[PDB]
Design brief:
The structure is a homodimer. By secondary structure, chain A is α+β, with helices and mostly antiparallel strands. The first copy, chain A, has one domain: Ribosomal Protein S8, Chain: A, domain 1 (2-Layer Sandwich), CATH 3.30.1370.10. Chain A contains 4 helices and 3 strands; from the N terminus they run E-H-H-E-H-E-H. A 3-stranded antiparallel beta sheet of chain A has the order 1-3-2. Chains A, B: This is KH domain-containing, RNA-binding, signal transduction-associated protein 1. Chains A, B: It is found in: Nucleus; Cytoplasm; Membrane. Chains A, B: Belongs to the KHDRBS family. Chains A, B: It comes from Homo sapiens.
């Protein structure tokens, strides 16, 4: 079962999703480039439009194979994600109505990038 | 952390929420009557409009104090919920994009019933 939502709680609810970037289904498609965009402007606009925090994470997320190597090796925990499957991490917060709405908007926008031929 | 969503999984995702009916904030407001409606037509329309399964559950959900007594006492597990705080149980299923969208729609419609003075 689950906890109950209390509409009168003073706390926001948080929703988080880690959506796998489907590199098996599209082995040569450059998702990282397409999602970040030049200078990361696509993903910036995406976050503004959707009202969600959205991040590309996992092996490949930095597009600089060497910088990733070095950052992983340095053992710093902020870069732990570099070992994970490449994926998009969506995070929203709000009262339930708003939180679901944001997550729905973000998830639908991200699906357009991750299923590029539909 | 969490499991990853795989957009290419053959399985639907399920989202469920149990939203407390706020009887403390509105001690005399008849939420059950308002949500079910005459002959349960409000909640039927609600489910059609939203595309979600929506149910009123918990003590009070049947509006017949006696029938609830008897059904609880009979020990039948389908009626276990009769002991729970009164609440609305929203259930949706679909691929992620659709599932969040449905949950967002349903949660927003249900909030209108549960915060009746906003």
């Amino acid at each position: 079962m689950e906890n109950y939502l209390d509409l009168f709680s003073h706390k926001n609810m948080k929703l988080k999703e880690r959506v796998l970037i489907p590199v098996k289904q599209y082995p040569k498609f450059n998702f990282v480039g397409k999602i970040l965009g030049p200078q990361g402007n696509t993903i910036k606009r995406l976050q503004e439009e959707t009202g969600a925090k959205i991040s590309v994470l996992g092996k490949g997320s930095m597009r600089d194979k060497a910088k990733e190597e070095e950052l992983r090796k340095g053992g710093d925990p902020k870069y732990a994600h570099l070992n994970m499957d490449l994926h998009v991490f969506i995070e929203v917060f709000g009262p339930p109505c708003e939180a679901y709405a944001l997550m729905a908007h973000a998830m639908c926008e991200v699906k357009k990038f991750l299923v590029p031929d539909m």
